[PDB]
């Protein structure tokens, strides 16, 4: 592996030398990049044919480095949230949330006014208080009586249509896992696939893992079958 | 139960770097509003007393913090070392600009300081200059304060 | 001591869209990349491939064999 550059070099890094020497050795010749993204591997041929190989490599190394910087940002947020500090990196909202409309989404700030709640240590709210507030929030009270006020249905719209199998015995069916059904069936028709010697890549579609091995086996046994009869 | 060990190597890794400027794509009014509105809403001319108390105590907190910090001996050594380093760098830069501007207008060691007292090396001229500038800056405060608080 | 937080969101900077609690919502955010649950194992495959490069755990055995 050291000759094909498939793995990192022979003695580039030493766990007991120093940090400076190790970053020097790794910053030397694109040692921080895998072979697939190392530009030297491709710097010699790229021209009229496709115009892509040297482009579709610098356009992948960029996505790679973006992923790495995002990981650093997430870990700084987690390290701030490990204490009770406010997070340094404000990220945009996601698929279930909207932005606050008092702040713009900038969650906190600096103010030149000393924020006495921190200075005296009163920034956490005493469990019993929160318990009371929530228990009173999840229990709306009805003071009126539906006799006096002719209110027959609970609040909401279209109550009339709302007023008109064995899920109670075996629970509901989970609908997030249909995409694996097919493979499961295969794993029941071919018990021999559970042998302790085999270890496929892994995946669900016809392009991954179990089905790849199965198609390969059937195709190669058919190839050998046809090669038996010709002779 | 296994025993754990101290980790002394590339520890953390995510702190060696300032990445604040990349994530916000660069390439605090609700705060004060809420503070002041709250002290207005809760507790004539009483809002003015409360606001003046707030501002005064904040400035005093910052000043007390600074002075108490600078009152530790080692912090004074730190300050002195920085002062002499900056003075030598200013000497270099000023010499360069002076000589080259002289040219173009014709066209158009450290230990003797680091090992001595500092009030005997520095003249009184600079103390008088600092005091004069400060005095001149803050001399209009009584009239300003009076004219503000009287409607 | 000088850090203050928004009092509505309590320093989260983000509130919920309640309709999405019980052709989607047009008001609330955009999905992320690791939300597509059909592409999970492919992304993990690429990542473990790239990680096998740097991995220097088995270094001494490879060294003696080399």
């Amino acid at each position: 592996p050291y000759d094909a550059d498939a793995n990192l070099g022979y003695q580039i890094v030493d766990p007991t030398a120093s940090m400076g020497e190790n970053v020097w050795n790794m910053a030397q010749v694109y040692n921080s990049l895998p072979p697939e993204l190392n530009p030297l591997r491709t710097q010699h041929l790229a021209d009229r044919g496709g115009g892509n190989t040297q482009a579709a490599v610098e356009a992948a190394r960029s996505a790679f480095d973006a992923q790495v910087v995002m990981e650093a940002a997430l870990l700084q947020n987690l390290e701030a949230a490990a204490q009770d500090l406010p997070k340094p990196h404000r990220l945009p909202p996601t698929a279930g949330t909207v932005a606050c409309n008092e702040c713009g989404g900038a969650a906190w700030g600096y103010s030149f006014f000393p924020n006495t709640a921190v200075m005296f240590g009163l920034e956490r709210p005493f469990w019993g208080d929160t318990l009371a507030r929530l228990s009173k929030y999840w229990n709306p009270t009805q003071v009126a009586d539906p006799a006096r006020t002719g209110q027959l249905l609970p609040y909401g719209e279209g109550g009339l249509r709302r007023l008109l199998a064995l899920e109670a015995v075996v629970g509901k069916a989970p609908a997030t896992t249909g995409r694996y059904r097919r493979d499961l069936e295969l794993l029941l028709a071919h018990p021999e696939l559970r042998d302790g010697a085999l270890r496929v890549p892994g995946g669900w579609g016809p392009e991954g893992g179990l089905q790849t091995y199965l198609r390969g086996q059937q195709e190669e046994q058919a190839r050998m079958q046809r090669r038996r009869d010709l002779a | 139960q296994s025993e754990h060990n101290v980790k002394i190597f590339h520890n953390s890794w995510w702190t060696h770097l300032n990445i604040k400027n990349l994530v916000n794509n660069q390439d605090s009014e609700f705060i004060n509003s809420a503070i002041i509105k709250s002290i207005n809403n809760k507790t004539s001319s009483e809002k003015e007393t409360m606001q003046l108390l707030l501002m005064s105590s904040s400035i005093l907190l910052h000043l007390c913090a600074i002075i108490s910090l600078v009152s530790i001996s080692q912090v004074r050594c730190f300050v002195k070392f920085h002062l002499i380093l900056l003075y030598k760098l200013s000497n270099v830069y000023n010499a360069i600009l002076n000589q080259l501007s002289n040219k173009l207008q014709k066209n158009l060691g450290f230990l003797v300081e680091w090992s001595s007292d500092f009030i005997t090396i520095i003249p009184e001229n600079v103390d008088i200059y600092i005091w004069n500038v400060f005095s001149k800056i803050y001399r209009t405060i009584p009239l300003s304060f009076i004219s503000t608080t009287l409607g | 001591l000088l850090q203050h937080k928004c009092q509505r969101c309590k320093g989260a900077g983000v509130m919920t869209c309640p309709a999405c609690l019980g052709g989607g919502c047009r008001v609330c955010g955009t999905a992320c990349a690791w939300d597509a649950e059909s592409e999970w194992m492919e992304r993990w495959g690429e990542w473990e491939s790239r990680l096998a490069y740097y991995d220097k755990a088995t270094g001494p055995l490879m060294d003696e064999w080399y």
């Binding site: 000393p114 006495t116 709640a117 005296f120 709210p125 208080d129 | 002290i39 409360m50 108390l53 | -």
Partner: peptide, 15 residues
């Protein structure tokens, strides 16, 4: 700042 703290402790929601 301990005089105003009951006032300024509404910005956090406590008493």
């Amino acid at each position: 700042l301990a005089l105003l703290t009951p006032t300024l402790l509404t910005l956090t929601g406590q008493s």
